[PDB]
Amino acid sequence: KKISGGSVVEMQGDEMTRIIWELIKEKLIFPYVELDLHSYDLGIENRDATNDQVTKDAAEAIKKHNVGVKCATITPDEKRVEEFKLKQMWKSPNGTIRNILGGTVFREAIICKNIPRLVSGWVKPIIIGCHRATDFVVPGPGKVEITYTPSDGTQKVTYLVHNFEEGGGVAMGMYNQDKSIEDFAHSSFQMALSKGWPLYLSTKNTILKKYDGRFKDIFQEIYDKQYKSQFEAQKIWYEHRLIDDMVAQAMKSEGGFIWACKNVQSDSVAQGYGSLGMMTSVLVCPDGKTVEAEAAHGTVTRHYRMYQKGQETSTNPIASIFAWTRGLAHRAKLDNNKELAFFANALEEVSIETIEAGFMTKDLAACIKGLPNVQRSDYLNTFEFMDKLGENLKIKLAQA
Amino acid sequence: KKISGGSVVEMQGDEMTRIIWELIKEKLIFPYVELDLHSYDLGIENRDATNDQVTKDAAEAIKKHNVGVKCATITPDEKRVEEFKLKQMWKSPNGTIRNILGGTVFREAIICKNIPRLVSGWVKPIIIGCHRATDFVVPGPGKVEITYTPSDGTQKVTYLVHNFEEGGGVAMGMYNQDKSIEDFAHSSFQMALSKGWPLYLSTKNTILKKYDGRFKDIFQEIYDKQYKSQFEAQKIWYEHRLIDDMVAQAMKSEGGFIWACKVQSDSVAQGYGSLGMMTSVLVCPDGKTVEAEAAHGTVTRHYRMYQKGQETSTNPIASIFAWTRGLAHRAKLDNNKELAFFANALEEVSIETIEAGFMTKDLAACIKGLPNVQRSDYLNTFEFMDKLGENLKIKLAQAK
Ligand SMILES: NC(=O)C1=CN([C@@H]2O[C@H](COP(=O)(O)OP(=O)(O)OC[C@H]3O[C@@H](n4cnc5c(N)ncnc54)[C@H](OP(=O)(O)O)[C@@H]3O)[C@@H](O)[C@H]2O)C=CC1
Ligand SMILES: NC(=O)C1=CN([C@@H]2O[C@H](COP(=O)(O)OP(=O)(O)OC[C@H]3O[C@@H](n4cnc5c(N)ncnc54)[C@H](OP(=O)(O)O)[C@@H]3O)[C@@H](O)[C@H]2O)C=CC1
Ligand SMILES: CC(C)c1onc(-c2c(Cl)cccc2Cl)c1C(=O)c1cn(C)c2c(/C=C/C(=O)O)cccc12
Numbered sequence: 197k198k199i200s201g202g203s204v205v206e207m208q209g210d211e212m213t214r215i216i217w218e219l220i221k222e223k224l225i226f227p228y229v230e231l232d233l234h235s236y237d238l239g240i241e242n243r244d245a246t247n248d249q250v251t252k253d254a255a256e257a258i259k260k261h262n263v264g265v266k267c268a269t270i271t272p273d274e275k276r277v278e279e280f281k282l283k284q285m286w287k288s289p290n291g292t293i294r295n296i297l298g299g300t301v302f303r304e305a306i307i308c309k310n311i312p313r314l315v316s317g318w319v320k321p322i323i324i325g326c327h328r329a330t331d332f333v334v335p336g337p338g339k340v341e342i343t344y345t346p347s348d349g350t351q352k353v354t355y356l357v358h359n360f361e362e363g364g365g366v367a368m369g370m371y372n373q374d375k376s377i378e379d380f381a382h383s384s385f386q387m388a389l390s391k392g393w394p395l396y397l398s399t400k401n402t403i404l405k406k407y408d409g410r411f412k413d414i415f416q417e418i419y420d421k422q423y424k425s426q427f428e429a430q431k432i433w434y435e436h437r438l439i440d441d442m443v444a445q446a447m448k449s450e451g452g453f454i455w456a457c458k459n460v461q462s463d464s465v466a467q468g469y470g471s472l473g474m475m476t477s478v479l480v481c482p483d484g485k486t487v488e489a490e491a492a493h494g495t496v497t498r499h500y501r502m503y504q505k506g507q508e509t510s511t512n513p514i515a516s517i518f519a520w521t522r523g524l525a526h527r528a529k530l531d532n533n534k535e536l537a538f539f540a541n542a543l544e545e546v547s548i549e550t551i552e553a554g555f556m557t558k559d560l561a562a563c564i565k566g567l568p569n570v571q572r573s574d575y576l577n578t579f580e581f582m583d584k585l586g587e588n589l590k591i592k593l594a595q596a
Numbered sequence: 597k598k599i600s601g602g603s604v605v606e607m608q609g610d611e612m613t614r615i616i617w618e619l620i621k622e623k624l625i626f627p628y629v630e631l632d633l634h635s636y637d638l639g640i641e642n643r644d645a646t647n648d649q650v651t652k653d654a655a656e657a658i659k660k661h662n663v664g665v666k667c668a669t670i671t672p673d674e675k676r677v678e679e680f681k682l683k684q685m686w687k688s689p690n691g692t693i694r695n696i697l698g699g700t701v702f703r704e705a706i707i708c709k710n711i712p713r714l715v716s717g718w719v720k721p722i723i724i725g726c727h728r729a730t731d732f733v734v735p736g737p738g739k740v741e742i743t744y745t746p747s748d749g750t751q752k753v754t755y756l757v758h759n760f761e762e763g764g765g766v767a768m769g770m771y772n773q774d775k776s777i778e779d780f781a782h783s784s785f786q787m788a789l790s791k792g793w794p795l796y797l798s799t800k801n802t803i804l805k806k807y808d809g810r811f812k813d814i815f816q817e818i819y820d821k822q823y824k825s826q827f828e829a830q831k832i833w834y835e836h837r838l839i840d841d842m843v844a845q846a847m848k849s850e851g852g853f854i855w856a857c858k859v860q861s862d863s864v865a866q867g868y869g870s871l872g873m874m875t876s877v878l879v880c881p882d883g884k885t886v887e888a889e890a891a892h893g894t895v896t897r898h899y900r901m902y903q904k905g906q907e908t909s910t911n912p913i914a915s916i917f918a919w920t921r922g923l924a925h926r927a928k929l930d931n932n933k934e935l936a937f938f939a940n941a942l943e944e945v946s947i948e949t950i951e952a953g954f955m956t957k958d959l960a961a962c963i964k965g966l967p968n969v970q971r972s973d974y975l976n977t978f979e980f981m982d983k984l985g986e987n988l989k990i991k992l993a994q995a996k
């Protein structure tokens with residue numbers, strides 16, 4: 197008999213990841229854990245068939261059950277419309293999901309002793325947390341001003357945006373509500389507490405004194421009113437940093453901090469570097485309770501094209517495995533479920549250990565060696581890597 | 597017999613870059629090129645002494661003579677005011693110069709075969725053309741609106757930015773003149789032709805339909821009406837891309853393009869450890885007036901050690917390329933084949949020197965990782981300059 201996992205929302209996706217996601221389910225999860233599974237097929241054809249209703253349902257299911265684990269999905273553009281004869285250019289499922297749950301996205305590279313890090317010298321995890329405008333055409337010369345009127349009618353403040361003198365142009369107004377800034381600090385301070393790392397907030401503070409200053413202020417305020425306690429408990433701390441100083445400190449750091457930044461191209465850097473397969477993602481809702489976990493990468497279309505043509509593929513499943521493990525860890529925490537907690541942690545260990553023992557997908561070998569120097573014998577194919585992880589997991593679980 | 601290089605505006609600067617600037621003039625330029633040299637000292641002391649007049653005169657001189665080359669300067673802050681006991685906290689020299697010249701800053705990484713790039717697929721250079729606002733605290737409930745008053749006394753136009761119904765927040769207005777958008781286009785269309793490459797503009801125009809839509813519209817209008825012909829004749833083209841699509845395209849690209857977009861860059865370059873290899877060119881819409889400089893600062897930290905008579909290893913490459921880019925433009929303007937050659941030769945010897953294994957510590961780190969770097973891996977500031985000097989002298993001898 198196996199573990200009772202409780203209620204999990206699961207979203208199937210597209211292309212190479214759809215394949216890996218099933219392998220993850222078949223080989224790593226279902227053998228050991230039983231779930232009250234709420235599964236939504238967010239494959240692109242099923243989204244088209246249901247007029248995207250399945251995406252909305254999936255999001256609502258996450259609101260209800262607190263835990264969502266999601267497979268990468270195709271975000272349609274014109275080419276995707278032609279390729280699948282879509283009825284419409286459906287919105288990003290991610291956009292729809294985040295819009296309904298709200299919250300803050302945290303990214304974290306999974307690290308292995310034998311895998312080079314972006315910055316040589318990083319030794320501990322780094323988690324990066326990231327945080328409607330009225331734009332119009334100004335058709336000729338004239339004054340654009342922005343005006344605030346308190347509802348108590350006591351005052352009016354008008355700021356000049358710009359005197360257009362030589363012609364027209366464009367202007368826009370933007371705003372943030374305090375609440376949203378509060379939510380972001382909450383998610384941030386809590387993640388720092390959940391991971392036991394210090395938290396830094398970076399802003400451009402000096403350019404937009406008032407806009408960024410309000411982040412600085414609310415973070416400090418919330419810190420001082422609700423976290424300085426627990427922070428000294430775990431022996432961590434919170435500080436604000438100018439982005440320029442933040443980048444510099446991080447350059448010299450050993451790692452082991454949460455980095456909230458007001459703004460982003462985190463994936464793009466991991467992508468160029470060749471380690472997007474190791475980059476995971478969790479959306480933390482303000483409420484402390486609801487999370488959605490997923491890989492940071494997409495559907496790996498290029499590998500899917502190879503697969504469909506019968507070429508061997510070597511696609512890294514780690515980010516996707518860690519979507520499940522962070523999902524289950526959080527489910528475990530809500531349910532005070534020692535067995536689930538043990539299982540999740542176990543699976544991450546197996547995944548990190550396997551790689552460290554020298555078995556890895558081609559992307560990671562390229563990371564070690566540079567792509568020109570990779571031999572087929574340096575890596576495992578997609579199924580080969582999954583089977584290895586499967587055996588090691590069996591072994592690890594058949595003890596203690 | 598030295599080359600007659602013609603009219604060049606040069607601007608001296610601050611701190612570590614100031615030392616290097618002189619070494620470049622004395623070791624790499626003056627032994628080979630005679631200039632009608634318009635030198636302005638934009639050193640912080642001298643800016644203070646002249647009440648910043650020197651910065652304005654430098655800018656006027658570039659306007660008159662078309663070619664500027666500029667050393668990194670200190671932008672005063674509060675700490676800086678105290679440090680030099682300044683009269684005021686002078687505006688940034690680069691700000692003053694840009695407002696007088698107008699134009700667009702193009703950034704370009706100098707590429708060496710042995711120095712890893714941000715994406716391993718990139719074979720050829722990429723040139724990024726990057727294009728303030730009014731923000732305030734909203735202290736509580738009430739209405740933020742943004743207003744356009746046409747100067748021809750036609751009726752006032754009001755847009756709601758947001759009703760704050762509970763609590764406060766922040767708000768800003770921003771703007772962009774058609775004229776500056778037209779310039780952006782001309783400068784980008786100019787740059788592409790000069791370098792003989794396709795040009796992409798990335799916007800977010802599905803989100804900011806009117807604001808980013810204005811950029812897209814005006815780029816197209818100006819291409820169609822005035823530039824397409826000259827683009828097809830060099831077998832290049834212009835295209836607009838949404839930012840996500842553009843990033844994706846760029847991930848899979850070989851390079852060899854101009855990228856016009858609307859502070860992430862310094863972060864990436866700084867983060868990798870390659871700020872010494874980033875050059876910057878302000879390109880005016882007239883196709884005639886340029887101003888070249890290092891994209892990095894005055895390297896205060898290295899200057900601190902140098903004041904203490906300790907060894908430094910500061911990368912002069914971006915500063916050198918400020919000269920070679922300015923001289924190449926000057927050479928192009930006056931059809932000066934000797935100077936053109938000399939500028940290329942100086943760029944090539946610089947790259948080749950690095951490629952042969954002689955480099956400054958920063959580039960050793962890129963190769964080895966900072967913790968794995970030792971003294972015998974690199975040259976100090978003065979050794980490296982000397983090395984470039986011998987190699988340049990040998991190269992030119994072989995060219996004759
Ligand atoms: N959250 C989501 O649902 C997301 C969805 N997408 C969607 O995914 C699709 C593919 O987008 P695309 O731009 O190709 O981006 P992907 O992130 O899917 O792939 C980009 C490249 O990154 C590398 N890579 C990414 N993940 C892995 C992995 N697990 N193993 C090995 N290498 C990996 C590969 O490099 P190489 O080619 O060198 O092997 C790959 O071709 C699109 O349809 C897009 O809409 C995109 C991002 C997020
Ligand atoms: N063009 C201009 O006029 C500009 C001027 N500035 C001014 O420069 C001053 C100092 O700014 P700072 O924040 O230190 O920014 P810098 O870019 O001057 O230095 C930041 C760090 O980047 C690395 N680096 C930069 N250039 C080189 C190089 N040539 N060789 C080796 N390493 C290099 C060093 O890292 P490490 O310390 O790890 O060795 C350095 O300390 C400020 O007063 C600022 O106003 C800033 C930007 C542009
Ligand atoms: C800001 C926007 C224009 C942008 O969007 N996405 C990237 C990006 C890419 Cl394409 C891939 C990886 C990492 C990043 Cl951030 C990116 C970006 O900042 C940059 C785009 N390039 C090409 C650079 C270079 C160039 C290096 C070179 O030629 O070797 C240097 C520093 C920043 C960027």
Ligand SMILES: CC(C)c1onc(-c2c(Cl)cccc2Cl)c1C(=O)c1cn(C)c2c(/C=C/C(=O)O)cccc12
Pocket residue numbers: 304305307313314315318321322324443446447457460461462463465466863864867868
């Ligand atoms: C925008 C801001 C958050 C930012 O600022 N500066 C960096 C950066 C650093 Cl610190 C150094 C090098 C390259 C970069 Cl771009 C940076 C940035 O994008 C990133 C910061 N980190 C830590 C990462 C990681 C993490 C890797 C790991 O844990 O092994 C992956 C991809 C992007 C970033």
